[PDB]
């Protein structure tokens, strides 16, 4: 039975009985490990939308309006979800305003609207971890690109803008503790920034890759466990377990086989990396492509052991997909989103089969977000 069918039967009955129609404003079910968010940059449109979906059934719970290239985030425990957005006085022109909003998780009502001084948001195609919430959910950290590298601290508890932290030529943010997060730098290393007690102290780990080794823009990461998974255009994967004390790299795992890498296999798409925390498994979007077609869609997902580097499965999507992620529950779902058809595809992580799809999601849906609350 379909959604619109179940709805019809439901209403036909209410009608058979007395049961009048008393129009009201809904509330979304409680947040669970199966809820997923689909932000939609819409190919650089001045305004955009994000859809909140129940993954177990593919039913839309509600939506959220955002401005220009906004960044979504979701407190792993489900206490809420937010976004950093940008609006203008006259649609796309005039006085700019960057701000952060925090939404009640069931009413979707904006419980906080915090303006960011001097429009400091890095206006850029959206990559999962370019912004992040401290693990204690008391702050939101975003990046500024011009005039100089900087990280803005947004106090979610006191609903206000803290300050800007000056950082090195590094990008992305990966929290590890209430006052420590790491960034990937131009110099080949990671930066460790401690912003505790009103001040910032920066450190640099050792270089863990060469100028020939291109880390993609879409690294996976788990705020809960600290695991960072970062590929290169070839599928080579540097991991690291961020702690606070510092980053402990692991032995690089080639996600693809020399036989595959031998036959043009390469990772491609948008959000191509997924790390299932509770299981320590990794999912990477890949297909056979030219070396300079790294943003095209892919039709396959490779799953492998994050500790051994041994392949567990190679799922065949059946569609041109651009982004993926998985639910953190014990029987994870595999999210496969296509900006080309604005359709989300949902598969059983274990079997790799498609269970259901949800279409008509904006103009070019690209970012998937979930809550890691299961365990």
């Amino acid at each position: 039975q379909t959604e619109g069918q179940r709805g019809a039967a439901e209403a036909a009955a209410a009608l058979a009985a007395g049961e009048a129609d008393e129009p009201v404003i809904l509330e979304a079910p409680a947040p669970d490990a199966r809820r997923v968010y689909i932000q939609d940059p819409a190919h650089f449109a001045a305004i955009t939308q994000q859809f909140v979906i129940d993954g177990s059934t593919g039913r839309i719970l509600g939506m959220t309006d955002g401005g220009f290239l906004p960044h979504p985030v979701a407190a792993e425990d489900g206490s809420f979800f937010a976004q950093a957005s940008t609006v203008f006085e006259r649609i796309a022109r005039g006085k700019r305003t960057d701000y952060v909003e925090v939404f009640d998780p069931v009413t979707f009502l904006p419980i906080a609207d915090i303006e960011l001084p001097d429009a400091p948001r890095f206006l850029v195609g959206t990559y999962q971890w370019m912004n992040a919430l401290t693990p204690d959910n008391k702050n939101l950290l975003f990046y500024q690109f011009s005039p100089a590298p900087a990280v803005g601290v947004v106090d979610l508890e006191g609903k206000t803008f803290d300050r800007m932290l000056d950082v090195p030529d590094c990008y992305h943010i990966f929290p590890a503790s209430p006052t420590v997060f790491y960034m990937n730098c131009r110099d080949g290393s990671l930066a460790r920034v401690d912003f505790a007690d009103g001040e910032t102290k920066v450190t640099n780990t050792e270089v863990f890759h060469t100028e020939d080794e291109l880390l993609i823009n879409h690294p996976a990461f788990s705020l809960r466990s600290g695991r960072l998974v970062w590929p290169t255009y070839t599928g080579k994967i540097f991991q690291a377990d961020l702690t606070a004390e510092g980053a402990t790299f692991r032995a690089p795992i080639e996600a693809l086989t020399e036989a595959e890498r031998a036959d043009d296999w390469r990772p491609g798409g948008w959000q191509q990396t997924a790390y299932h925390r509770q299981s320590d498994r990794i999912y990477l979007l890949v297909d056979q492509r030219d070396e300079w077609k790294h943003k095209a869609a892919s039709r396959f997902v490779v799953v492998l052991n994050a500790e051994t580097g041994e392949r567990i499965n190679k799922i065949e999507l059946g569609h041109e997909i651009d982004s993926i992620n998985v639910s953190q529950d014990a029987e994870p779902l595999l999210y496969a989103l296509s900006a080309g058809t604005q359709t989300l595809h949902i598969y059983d992580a274990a079997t790799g089969e498609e269970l259901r799809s949800v279409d008509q999601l904006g103009r070019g849906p690209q970012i998937i977000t979930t809550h890691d609350m299961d365990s």
Binding site: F145, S146, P147, A148, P149, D169, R186
Partner: protein
């Protein structure tokens, strides 16, 4: 509005740079001479040795209340700024924020 005085808006040819002037080259994505110091009233010339477009820029409040952005330079082009006041002026490349240098004026 200006502790500096820009001679020309459009970049000049490397050749027209007076061969006796203070010159900050640019190559490999860097201002080859990071920190340079002159005297109030003098003129610094920037010369780009590669194709990669580059320029000189200042945030607001540095070279005055309003932020300043020189024009871009491609290979073998130059751009000049005369610093009319003693001070320490930090600068960067517009599209390339990871490129910085300074002009200490005395």
């Amino acid at each position: 509005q200006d502790k500096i005085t820009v001679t020309s808006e459009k970049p000049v040819a490397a050749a027209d740079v007076p061969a006796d002037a203070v010159v900050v080259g640019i190559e490999k994505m860097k201002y080859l001479t990071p920190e340079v110091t002159i005297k109030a009233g003098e003129t610094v010339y920037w010369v780009n040795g590669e194709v990669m477009p580059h320029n000189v820029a200042f945030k607001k409040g540095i070279v005055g209340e309003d932020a300043f952005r020189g024009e871009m330079m491609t290979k073998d082009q130059a751009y000049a700024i005369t610093f009319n006041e003693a001070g320490s002026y930090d600068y960067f490349c517009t599209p390339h924020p990871f490129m910085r240098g300074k002009v200490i004026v005395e």
